[PDB]
Design a protein around this ligand. Structure first.
Ligand SMILES: [Mg+2]
Ligand SMILES: [Mg+2]
Length: 1103
């Protein structure tokens, strides 16, 4: 259709992965249910699991034997306990680092007795009792498992290290138990429940060789190191089942839980005791007991109760209640200095913005408009004082002239700490989830004040002591939810089934099989079609030769159609392997000193061409080479050998034979079918793989590999099929079409339209297809919600392209700033951009003729591949990029923009600001005030931009942010009448038409200039919207050279009819500058396409 788009048909090969649903046919369901998947691999995996279990048992017994000999005196824990419970590490970092060094020394002492002990294990013998004497072998990756076990033996300060669990994680629990016991030692003065019932019962195996207090001695840590020590500790701390089986002796926790006879306030809030953790503890095997998924609800309840006790505690040894301590500390932020407390620059600044002001973008514009202008020198951490200074002057978009912010950040923190709900204090899943979500909310709220790692991109200047020293130690006690919550997300949400992957490989019909490359047979599968429904034909590895020497039996029987795949892969790597690198080279007789190594290239190509005719199967491809002695470097010729090698032929096979095969069980047959098997593109591509109009000149190629996905739980329900195909297989390597798109854009620009896409404030994305003369032609747009929308707007963009002969001008996120409340998140726009280029990479229309320039066999390729390049222009074919900007505030008729930036400040600045205006006159004939000025005195503009702002009126003003005292209410305000009222109130005359600058420059009242600046900022406010409704129009204060004022409500269809279409019409208008630059350039290989706010403002303003 279009003249330019016709030439962009075969630009570069593309790769896709088709997705289909398979339903088993006949006995296949029963066979896959009973026999399962490939049985040899299942048996190999079972034997591997058995030998791994044997190895794990041997490792566990060796570990226990080695740990049974370690002594405390040699380790040195006796002097380590005092340093551990001295708790002085918090006060000084030197003590903490000394403690860490001592811990490292102790862990080294622990691990140095592991490797060499007990013959260094005999796992090497097990690598070579029936399952270990002989097995499947198959050189499995047992080296990785051995390395993992060695790292588990190591001391790399990881969860796999034994010493990490025994000193870093068990020992704190031991010390906490000691500190509890030294206070509750008198819990059993009668000693009848202490020794008469426990010391003789729980130690029957050792014949009572120890006592209850023996475990409560610091010098007997070595006893609890072994698994038996942990077992006896758990039995003595939480009861034992006993040999009787029904007595169920109560543990220490139950013993202290009977303290309800002391109902006074000093008996409750009892901290639950901490049983010691045990490795290799599970129903079958735990492998050091990583608690990533737990075992049952019992351990989950134990962990939840443990954290609940650790958080609230009992207000002993100072206020240990983290919930109220953190609230008080945050409420104390105002007193602390704000010059050194830091705030994260991440998305948290949005959440702070939404609470203080109600506008999620107030803070983000304030930093990027007043603090700094370059790339802002983006740093990771801000400061409280800098944020307060920036928010103390942010142009006051629409609010009271003076805002009672005071210490806004500190007020926000202290109000959200305790005044947010006043309900911070609190087996069922509902209660646990509510508690975890409340802690999630608290942690997210307190996260901005936290310092991430150390020295993050500099900053990290000397912080205050009295606040940050407390906060860093306080946050870690509360940050423990983030991993623990994961366990809840990992245990309570688990699927009973598992997703398994099978790799398929369609059987090539060439003589390549077995001759040169037979590295991996995988699961060779065939492809069958009967009446238009294609099938998948997986065959068992035991019966690969079923489809060989099949004579079709007799005729007159119904026949399946079977594909005969013929592919020649990797011509450059495979062709010289057969000819003069292996396979009886002396038969072909190349001579010519084997062409040296691998006009010499042309001679080698001629030798290849003449030797191909010698081969029998390779001749059946019908090779049609280019004329001899016309090639580039030999590799290019290989392309032809690879390009003409692929061929698909369909033969007939007896249906009765196939049915007998599927009944026996040698053939897993799955019917390939989508739900509508609405013509999908994937169905269109699949039916074009075996199309007669496609196989004469291949455009779609079946790669050869495929994956089938199922939902094994011994029953299988869901089946999936992933087929990677190659589109535009016989396509020239003309990638990066930018060098050719610009040629046409220079050639025939006067017929090119432009499509502009903007992130609106009301609508997500807004389009505006403008002509070459600035006239709008058509304005549109209004995992399941966002993806469904982005898959519909992309279809409209890709339809307006070919239909209206237009180009697309998008926005570049990482090269600018958007000063507004754009409704599209960064992660949603960055995926719409990906889904737009992917749609324009291979754009095909079903209704078009297959050979038409936009049909199936000739598909538009309008953009290059999705590259991660971050440059100035980044022109992707016909899709241009411009720096992100808030273009909605520009006047389409004359390009006027509000660059005044007036705000209430000291009276001297207000007096000086209004002296720069040329006139403050009052046109009584048309009844509005005319501010005549020039932008040179206000900014660094071109000095030739003399405007005339007229107070036309009918503007919408937003009061404030909260409900009643503050209010989001928006009032339609008559600017002219308000100006007249203000001037009449303060004894100023304007009815005579005289200049009002002298009178304005005389009044010294602070309130008068406040109202004057508020009204002047109202007049220049163009984009004004009623909150919660669809009233959003662009009123223009400046003239139009004919005594007219732009008004989107009264505007015709040539100009934007909405305040959001003005943001998309001024992005499409940026594209016009791109077209003019392309037309007015002479390089076409190094051409600038960077939009700068200076040059484009001159461009629009000459309209
Ligand atoms: Mg925009
Ligand atoms: Mg906009």
């Amino acid at each position: 259709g279009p003249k330019m788009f016709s030439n962009f048909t075969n630009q570069y090969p593309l790769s896709k992965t088709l997705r289909f649903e398979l339903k088993p046919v006949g006995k296949t369901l029963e066979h896959i249910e009973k026999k399962g998947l490939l049985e040899q691999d299942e048996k190999r995996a079972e034997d591997y699991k058995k030998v791994k279990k044997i190895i794990d048992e041997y490792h566990k017994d060796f570990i226990e034997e080695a740990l049974n000999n370690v002594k405390l005196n040699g380790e040195g824990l006796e002097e380590y306990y005092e340093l551990y419970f001295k708790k002085n590490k918090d006060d000084k970092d030197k003590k903490k680092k000394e403690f860490e060094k001592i811990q490292d020394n102790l862990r080294k002492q622990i691990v140095e007795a592991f490797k060499n002990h007990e013959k260094y294990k005999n796992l090497f013998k097990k690598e070579l009792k029936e399952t270990v004497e002989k097995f499947k072998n198959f050189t499995t990756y047992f080296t990785g498992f051995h390395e993992n076990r060695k790292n588990m033996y190591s001391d790399e300060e990881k969860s796999t290290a034994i010493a990490y669990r025994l000193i870093h994680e068990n020992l704190p629990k031991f010390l906490d138990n000691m500190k509890v016991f030294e206070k509750i030692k008198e819990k059993h003065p009668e000693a009848e429940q202490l020794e008469k019932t426990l010391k003789d019962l729980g130690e029957e195996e050792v014949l009572g060789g120890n006592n209850v207090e023996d475990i409560f001695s610091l010098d007997y840590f070595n006893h609890t190191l072994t698994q038996s020590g942990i077992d006896i500790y758990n039995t003595i701390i939480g009861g034992k089942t006993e040999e009787d089986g029904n007595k169920k002796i109560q543990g220490l926790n139950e013993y202290i839980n009977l303290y309800r006879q002391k109902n006074n306030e000093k008996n409750r809030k009892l901290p639950k005791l901490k049983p010691l953790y045990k490795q290799i503890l599970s129903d079958r095997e735990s492998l050091s007991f990583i608690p990533e998924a737990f075992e049952n609800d019992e351990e989950l309840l134990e962990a939840i109760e443990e954290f609940y006790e650790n958080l609230n505690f009992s207000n002993n040894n100072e206020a240990t209640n983290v919930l109220e301590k953190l609230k008080e500390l945050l409420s104390n932020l105002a007193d602390y200095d704000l010059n050194k407390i830091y705030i994260r620059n991440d998305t948290s600044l949005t959440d702070i913005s939404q609470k203080i002001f109600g506008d999620w973008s107030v803070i983000k514009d304030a930093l990027n408009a007043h603090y700094d202008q370059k790339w802002l020198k983006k740093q990771k951490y801000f400061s409280i004082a800098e944020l307060q200074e920036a928010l103390d002057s942010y142009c006051k978009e629409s609010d009271e002239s003076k805002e009672q912010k005071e210490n806004s950040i500190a007020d926000y923190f202290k109000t959200l700490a305790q005044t947010k709900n006043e309900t911070d204090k609190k087996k069922d899943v509902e209660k646990i989830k509510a508690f975890l979500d409340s802690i999630m909310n608290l942690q997210h709220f307190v996260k901005p004040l936290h310092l991430v790692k150390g020295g993050s991109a500099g900053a990290e200047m000397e912080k205050d002591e009295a606040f940050y020293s407390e906060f860093e130690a306080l946050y870690e006690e509360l940050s423990q939810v983030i991993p623990l919550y994961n366990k809840v997300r990992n245990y309570l949400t688990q699927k009973p089934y598992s997703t398994e992957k099978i790799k398929l490989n369609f059987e090539n019909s060439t003589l390549l099989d077995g001759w040169d490359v037979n590295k991996e047979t995988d699961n060779t599968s065939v492809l069958l079609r009967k009446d238009g429904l294609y099938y998948l034909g997986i065959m068992n590895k035991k019966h690969n030769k079923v489809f060989e020497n099949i004579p079709e039996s007799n005729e007159n029987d119904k026949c399946y159609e079977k594909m005969d795949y013929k592919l020649l892969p990797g011509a450059n790597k495979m062709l010289p392997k057969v000819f003069f690198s292996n396979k009886n080279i002396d038969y072909f007789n190349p001579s010519a000193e084997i062409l040296e190594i691998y006009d010499d290239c042309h001679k080698l190509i001629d030798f290849f061409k003449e030797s191909i005719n010698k081969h029998e199967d390779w001749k059946k491809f019908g090779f049609k080479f280019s004329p001899t002695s016309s090639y580039e470097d030999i590799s290019g010729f290989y392309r032809e050998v690879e390009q003409q090698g692929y061929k698909i032929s369909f033969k007939n096979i007896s249906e009765s034979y196939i049915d007998e095969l599927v009944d026996e069980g040698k053939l897993y047959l799955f019917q390939i079918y989508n739900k509508d098997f609405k013509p999908n593109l994937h169905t269109l591509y699949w039916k074009a793989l075996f199309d007669e109009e496609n196989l004469k000149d291949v455009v779609y190629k079946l790669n050869g590999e495929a994956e089938v996905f199922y939902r094994k739980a011994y029953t299988v329900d869901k089946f999936q099929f992933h087929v990677p195909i190659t589109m535009n297989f016989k396509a020239e390597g003309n990638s990066n079409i930018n060098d050719e798109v610009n040629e046409f854009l220079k050639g025939n620009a006067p017929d090119v339209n432009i499509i502009g896409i903007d992130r609106g404030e009301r609508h997500l994305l807004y389009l505006t297809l403008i002509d070459q003369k600035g006239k709008i032609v058509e304005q549109d747009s209004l995992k399941e919600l966002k993806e469904g929308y982005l898959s519909q707007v992309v279809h409209k963009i890709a339809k307006l392209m070919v239909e209206h002969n237009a180009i697309v001008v998008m926005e570049d996120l990482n090269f600018g700033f958007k000063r507004g409340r754009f409704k599209v998140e960064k992660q949603v726009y960055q995926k719409f951009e990906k889904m737009l280029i992917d749609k324009l990479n291979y754009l095909v229309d079903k209704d078009k003729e297959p050979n038409e320039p936009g049909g199936l066999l000739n598909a538009y390729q309008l953009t290059n591949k999705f590259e991660s390049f971050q440059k100035m222009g980044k022109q992707s074919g016909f899709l241009f990029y411009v720096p992100a900007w808030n273009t909605s505030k520009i006047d389409p008729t004359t390009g006027f923009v509000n660059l005044f930036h007036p705000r209430y400040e000291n009276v001297e600045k207000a007096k000086e600001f209004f002296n720069k205006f040329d006139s403050i006159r009052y046109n009584s004939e048309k009844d509005y005030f005319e501010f005549a000025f020039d932008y040179n005195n206000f900014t660094e503009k071109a000095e030739g931009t003399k405007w005339t702002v007229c107070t036309y009126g009918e503007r919408i003003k937003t009061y404030r942010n909260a409900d009643k005292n503050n209010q989001w209410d928006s009032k339609e305000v008559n600017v002219t009448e308000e100006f007249k009222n203000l001037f009449d109130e303060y004894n100023i005359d304007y009815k005579n038409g005289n200049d009002l600058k002298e009178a304005i420059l005389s009044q010294d009242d602070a309130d008068f200039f406040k109202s004057l600046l508020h009204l002047l900022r109202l007049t220049l406010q163009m984009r004004n919207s009623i909150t919660g409704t669809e009233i959003d129009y662009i009123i223009s204060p400046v003239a139009n050279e004919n005594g007219e004022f732009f008004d989107s409500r009264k505007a015709d269809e040539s100009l934007p009819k909405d305040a959001d279409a003005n943001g998309a019409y001024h992005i499409a208008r940026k594209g016009l500058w791109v077209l003019e630059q392309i037309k007015q350039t002479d390089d076409l290989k190094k051409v600038n396409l960077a939009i700068s706010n200076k040059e484009w403002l001159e461009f629009v303003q000459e309209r």
